[PDB]
Write a protein that binds this ligand. Structure first.
Ligand code: HEC
Length: 81
């Protein structure tokens, strides 16, 4: 994945995950520096609705907007922070 392409795509994500990938809403997760493969698999889990219920509903919607390339790029960006 291409971290610069990920940075471009992350504008929408920053409202909930923070400009720097540290979230500031209680209950919302930090992404900054998270394992790259884990970020991939976790966004794919939401896209496949293998995570459900509660705040997952929200990420299901977000994940459905992302192509497999976008997910790779986002993971490269966040893991690099
Ligand atoms: C609120 C309007 C959000 C937007 C926009 C984005 N995300 Fe999100 N994300 C949000 C919540 C509340 C949660 C927790 C959901 C849960 O199952 O409890 C998440 C979770 C993630 C994760 C998983 C993190 C983990 O540690 O397993 C990822 C990788 C993630 N979110 C990524 C992400 C991306 C890349 C976004 C822009 C396309 C994005 N989210 C937007 C809230 C919100």
């Amino acid at each position: 994945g291409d971290a610069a392409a990920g940075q471009a795509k992350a504008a929408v994500c920053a409202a909930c995950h923070g400009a720097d990938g540290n979230a500031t809403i209680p209950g919302y997760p930090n992404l900054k520096g998270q394992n790259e493969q884990y970020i991939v698999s976790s966004i794919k889990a939401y896209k496949n609705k293998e995570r459900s219920g509660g705040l997952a509903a929200v990420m299901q919607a977000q994940a459905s907007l992302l192509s497999d390339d976008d997910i790779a790029n986002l993971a490269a960006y966040y893991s690099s922070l």
